[PDB]
A paper describes a structure:
Since the two halves of sTIM11 can assemble into a TIM‐barrel like dimer, we believed the loop in the middle of the protein sequence to be maximal tolerant for the structural modification and chose it as the target site for the helical extension. We further introduced a small change to the sTIM11 scaffold by removing two cysteine residues that were originally introduced to form a disulfide bridge to improve barrel closure. Moreover, the design showed a similar thermal stability to sTIM11noCys with a melting temperature of 66°C. The protein was crystallized and diffraction data collected and processed to a resolution of 1.58 Å. The introduced helix showed elevated B‐factors, making it more difficult to model. While a helical structure was formed, it is wound slightly different than expected and forms a 310 helix instead of a classical α‐helix. In addition, its position is slightly twisted and it packs more closely and flat onto the barrel surface compared to the design model, which projected the helix to be more exposed. Interestingly, the experimental structure revealed a different hydrophobic packing and showed Met94 to rather enter the barrel by inserting its side chain in between the β‐sheet core and the outer barrel α‐helix. Due to this, several polar contacts that had been predicted between the first residues of the inserted helix and its surrounding could not form, but a polar contact between Ser90 and Asp71 is established instead. Thus, the de novo TIM barrel accommodates the newly inserted 310 helix by a rearrangement of the packing of the barrel helix.
Author numbering: 1 to 190
The structure:
């Protein structure tokens, strides 16, 4: 629900968070979240066609940290061309053309100015290996909050510099933040 999701952004802003993220398929929803305190606007392209047009509008509106969630490297490339600077990928990307072709293609983009790769997983080893191969942002997606907070904590101890965590509940996001997460993704897509 849009109203409740926006409220999560607002409460996190009131708590002092400065790297709030917001995930939606709709640029108008993302623009409102931006107004309310979200700095990272995640365009959800997971089941949509030409979702890079959402990136185009957000670019026009003046947002500077637009992310694009896709496991299709050609689609991520087009999103980058349309103004996305954070490319959010997962294990599903290595599905097609095995031998890191997809990963390697997103790595070519990472060499383009401030372009960053974010890798999401619910699996610790997956996340660690993605970090080793050059992921800039590590999104802890385990739904066992106990396991997720242990992973946020260990990433901090191991020196990961941009740990992210996703929830539909600002209270969980605040707990992740306290434990070392810097990027707090409000995600009411479910
Ligand atoms: Cl995401």
């Amino acid at each position: 629900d849009k109203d409740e999701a926006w409220k999560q952004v607002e409460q996190l802003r009131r708590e002092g968070a400065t790297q709030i993220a917001y995930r939606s398929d709709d640029w108008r929803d993302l623009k409102e979240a931006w107004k309310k305190g979200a700095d990272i606007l995640i365009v959800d392209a997971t089941d949509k066609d030409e979702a890079w047009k959402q990136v185009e509008q957000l670019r026009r509106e003046g947002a500077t940290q637009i992310a694009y969630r896709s496991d299709d490297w050609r689609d991520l490339k087009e999103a980058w061309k349309k103004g996305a600077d954070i490319l959010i990928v997962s294990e599903e990307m290595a599905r097609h053309a095995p031998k890191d072709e997809a990963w390697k293609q997103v790595e070519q983009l990472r060499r383009e100015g401030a372009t960053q790769i974010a890798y999401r997983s619910d699996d610790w080893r997956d996340l660690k290996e993605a970090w080793k191969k050059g992921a800039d942002i590590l999104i802890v997606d385990a739904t066992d909050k106990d396991e997720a907070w242990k992973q946020v904590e260990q990433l901090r101890r191991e020196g990961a510099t941009q740990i992210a965590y996703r929830s539909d509940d600002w209270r969980d996001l605040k707990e992740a933040w306290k434990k070392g997460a810097d990027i707090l993704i409000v995600d009411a897509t479910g």
